[PDB]
């Protein structure tokens, strides 16, 4: 019940250096300094594919007017901008490779900064894809396979006992967001894998090290 409230200036002063570190990159930040403009750039299908645009100058504006209540909302907007560019642009394009550079930079900046706002780290996604099971046989990362509605999986060399059975293609290269658990006292979202350990149990709810 002693919830942590971040004031705008606390967030701005801590996080703006991670944004400036992206803005610094030349030429890699140049497609990202201003909102995507589909008529000017002559890409009329952009908003058919990208439903929620995001860019460095919008993120800076939101930090400047205190529209972030807690720092993961900022991290989410950054990854939104990256994921928009990776989706819209082809793997071989300049814009895409620029995006992967900005991402590398951010992942190296964000952890100390999130730790100074009291968090475990600042990494949004899992390190590794989840080993999928082949319907004893399992599928490693990046391995190719066939799927149906996310449910049943088969390795390409193959392709509940009481449930009456009935009778596309992908690659296992996707990272899920790293799941969270809330501090019972301050309300901070921490990563389960960062703060929960095989030998500790939390009968009355997780409490982070700042609140202990
Ligand atoms: C971020 C995103 O998803 N966008 C969507 C696609 C896009 C963007 C930019 C773009 C916008 C503003 C500045 C840019 C600057 C450079 C640049 C500057 N120096 N260097 C070596 C490259 N490149 C692309 C830019 N173009 N396109 C393509 C337009 C069609 O034609 C091929 C490129 C934005
Ligand atoms: Zn963490
Ligand atoms: Zn198999
Ligand atoms: Zn706490």
Curated annotation (Swiss-Prot):
User: Which intervals of the chain are annotated as region Interaction with histone?
Assistant: 45-91
Q: What is the effect of changing residue 100 to I?
A: Impairs interaction with ASF1A
Bromo domain residues: 6-113
Give the disulfide map.
none
**Stated consequence of mutating residue 178 to K:** In RSTS1; abolishes acetyltransferase activity
Q: Give the superkingdom in one word.
A: Eukaryota
Its localization reads: Cytoplasm; Nucleus
Q: How does it assemble?
A: Found in a complex containing NCOA2; NCOA3; IKKA; IKKB and IKBKG. Probably part of a complex with HIF1A and EP300. Interacts with GATA1; the interaction results in acetylation and enhancement of transcriptional activity of GATA1. Interacts with MAF and ZCCHC12. Interacts with DAXX; the interaction is dependent on CBP sumoylation and results in suppression of the transcriptional activity via recruitment of HDAC2 to DAXX. Interacts with phosphorylated CREB1. Interacts with CITED4 (C-terminal region). Interacts (via the TAZ-type 1 domain) with HIF1A.
What is recorded about the domains?
Answer: The KIX domain mediates binding to HIV-1 Tat.
Give a short account of what the protein does.
Acetylates histones, giving a specific tag for transcriptional activation. Mediates acetylation of histone H3 at 'Lys-18' and 'Lys-27' (H3K18ac and H3K27ac, respectively). Also acetylates non-histone proteins, like DDX21, FBL, IRF2, MAFG, NCOA3, POLR1E/PAF53 and FOXO1. Binds specifically to phosphorylated CREB and enhances its transcriptional activity toward cAMP-responsive genes. Acts as a coactivator of ALX1. Acts as a circadian transcriptional coactivator which enhances the activity of the circadian transcriptional activators: NPAS2-BMAL1 and CLOCK-BMAL1 heterodimers.
Query: What protein name is recorded for this chain?
Result: CREB-binding protein
Task: Give the originating organism.
Answer: Homo sapiens
């Amino acid at each position: 019940s002693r919830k942590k409230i971040f004031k705008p200036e606390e967030l701005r002063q801590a996080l703006m250096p991670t944004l400036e570190a992206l803005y610094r990159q030349d030429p890699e930040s140049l497609p990202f300094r201003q909102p995507v403009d589909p008529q000017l750039l002559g890409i009329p299908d952009y908003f058919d594919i990208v439903k929620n645009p995001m860019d460095l100058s919008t993120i800076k504006r939101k930090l400047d007017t205190g529209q972030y209540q807690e720092p993961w909302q900022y991290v989410d907007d950054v990854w939104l901008m990256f994921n928009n560019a990776w989706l819209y642009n082809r793997k071989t394009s300049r814009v895409y490779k620029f995006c992967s550079k900005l991402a590398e930079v951010f992942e190296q900046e964000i952890d100390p900064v999130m730790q100074s706002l009291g968090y475990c780290c600042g990494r949004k996604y899992e390190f590794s894809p989840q080993t999928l099971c082949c319907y004893l046989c399992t599928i490693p990362r990046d391995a190719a396979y066939y799927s149906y509605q996310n449910r049943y999986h088969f390795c390409e060399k193959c392709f509940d006992p009481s449930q009456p059975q009935t009778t596309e293609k992908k690659k296992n290269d996707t990272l899920d967001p790293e799941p969270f658990v809330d501090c019972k006292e301050c309300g901070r979202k921490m990563h389960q894998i960062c703060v929960l350990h095989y030998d500790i149990i939390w009968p009355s709810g997780f409490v982070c090290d700042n609140c202990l």
